[PDB]
């Protein structure tokens, strides 16, 4: 089934129908006119951030390079491998970029402090994949550039997703969502899910502990807000 799209729902409607029961939704008309949506070209990113060091996931290895090197090696030049500037607090590192985003007003429905909201950048070429995993906070995933295919499985379905047994990976499924090994993981086939293609200006609410799998369909930039 599809994730529902709602235009600027009230705080109360969002709280009652989505946050408290733990149901995903796409919020429209919320982030669509943030400055990032028109300002963040590759060239702008190079101008503001190009000389700064970022962590880059390659493949599986973790390396460090400048933003300029990342763009040259993994985005613009026929790249040899997939590289992803994933899960990085770029906005703490480069505070000028905070001017181009906002914290969604819905985060004020949580029990946590605004100071403790973690804002991560996710910037990479077409074809980056984040395997199916769950996170311990609520998330608003804001799509700025490009589109992502997203699959969502409820925490009720965790038995059918065969989480890894190691503590480093217990929040991650052993299954490759788009090419599952049903001989090894047969319960996966019948597990229900939601999916969407998340486009620029749209926000995906991923409830706490909802399993999510993400594949970039174009050159992509997303901003996540982890909150409670
Ligand atoms: O966009 C991605 O590739 C994954 C993002 C996601 O896991 C998150 O927690 O925001
Ligand atoms: Mn995540």
């Amino acid at each position: 089934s599809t994730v529902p799209r709602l235009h600027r729902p009230s705080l109360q409607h969002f709280r009652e129908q989505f946050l408290v029961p733990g149901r995903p939704v796409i919020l429209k008309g919320v982030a669509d006119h943030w400055p990032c949506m028109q300002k963040w070209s590759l060239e702008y990113i190079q101008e503001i951030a190009g000389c700064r060091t970022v962590p880059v996931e390659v493949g599986w290895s973790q390396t460090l390079m400048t933003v300029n090197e990342f763009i040259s090696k993994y985005i613009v030049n026929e790249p040899r491998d997939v590289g992803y500037l994933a899960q990085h607090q770029l906005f703490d590192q480069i505070p000028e970029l905070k001017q181009d985003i906002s914290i969604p007003d819905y985060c004020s429905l949580g029990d946590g402090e605004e100071e403790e909201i973690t804002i991560n950048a996710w910037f990479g070429p077409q074809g980056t994949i984040s395997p199916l995993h769950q996170d311990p906070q609520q998330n608003f995933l804001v799509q700025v550039m490009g589109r992502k295919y997203i699959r969502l499985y409820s925490p009720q379905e965790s038995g059918a997703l065969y989480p890894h047994d190691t503590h480093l990976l217990h929040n991650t499924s052993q299954v490759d969502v788009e090419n599952p090994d049903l001989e090894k993981f047969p319960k996966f086939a019948k597990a229900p899910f939601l999916s969407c293609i998340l486009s620029p200006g749209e926000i995906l609410f991923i409830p706490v502990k909802y399993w999510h799998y993400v594949r970039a369909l174009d050159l992509s930039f997303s901003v996540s807000f982890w909150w409670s």
Side-chain angles (χ1 to χ4, degrees), residues 1-11 13-37 39-59 61-72 74-95 97-164 166-167 169-189 191-228:
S1 205
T2 48
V3 179
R5 283 176 164 82
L6 295 190
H7 180 85
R8 297 182 65 82
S10 63
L11 296 187
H13 179 40
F14 174 79
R15 178 189 260 164
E16 287 178 350
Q17 295 305 310
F18 298 99
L19 174 64
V20 167
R23 300 179 43 226
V25 63
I26 293 166
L27 305 173
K28 301 277 283 170
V30 175
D32 58 322
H33 298 302
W34 291 359
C36 56
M37 303 294 168
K39 288 174 62 170
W40 288 4
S41 59
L42 284 185
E43 291 84 2
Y44 176 92
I45 293 161
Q46 282 171 318
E47 182 190 313
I48 191 158
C51 284
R52 309 296 304 277
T53 302
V54 291
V56 175
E57 298 181 4
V58 180
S61 64
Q62 303 182 316
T63 195
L64 291 167
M65 66 193 70
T66 71
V67 168
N68 279 331
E69 292 178 289
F70 175 69
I71 289 169
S72 179
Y74 293 104
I75 289 174
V76 303
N77 289 305
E78 194 180 354
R80 282 59 170 170
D81 288 329
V82 188
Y84 194 15
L85 204 185
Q87 201 181 322
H88 180 59
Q89 295 173 66
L90 185 68
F91 306 93
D92 277 355
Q93 180 182 23
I94 311 179
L97 287 171
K98 287 186 209 186
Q99 300 297 305
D100 300 332
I101 58 169
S102 309
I103 288 165
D105 290 333
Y106 304 90
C107 296
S108 64
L109 302 169
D111 302 307
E113 297 290 348
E114 188 170 285
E115 282 84 352
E116 295 304 285
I117 294 175
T118 299
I119 311 178
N120 280 296
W122 308 76
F123 171 48
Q126 173 170 335
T128 63
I129 293 173
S130 289
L132 187 67
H133 67 283
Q134 56 178 185
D135 294 303
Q137 291 197 89
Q138 318 287 355
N139 185 1
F140 285 127
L141 183 66
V142 180
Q143 194 62 17
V144 179
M145 177 191 301
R147 299 168 301 144
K148 276 169 160 173
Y149 174 64
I150 300 180
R151 290 269 282 279
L152 302 168
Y153 294 77
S154 154
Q156 297 178 343
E157 303 310 324
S158 303
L161 310 177
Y162 303 88
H164 285 269
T166 71
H167 194 72
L169 290 167
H170 184 52
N171 76 324
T172 297
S173 169
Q174 297 171 257
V175 185
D176 180 341
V177 164
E178 293 189 83
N179 190 14
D181 179 344
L182 296 182
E183 297 165 337
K184 194 159 185 78
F185 304 122
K187 294 186 285 181
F188 181 82
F193 58 86
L194 301 175
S195 74
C196 63
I197 295 178
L198 189 71
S199 283
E202 297 186 332
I203 307 181
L204 175 66
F205 170 56
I206 304 175
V208 60
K209 301 295 276 271
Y210 224 95
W211 296 87
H212 47 293
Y213 166 90
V214 181
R215 174 163 62 95
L217 305 180
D218 318 287
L219 173 64
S220 173
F221 202 126
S222 318
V223 178
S224 60
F225 298 80
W226 290 344
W227 60 284
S228 286

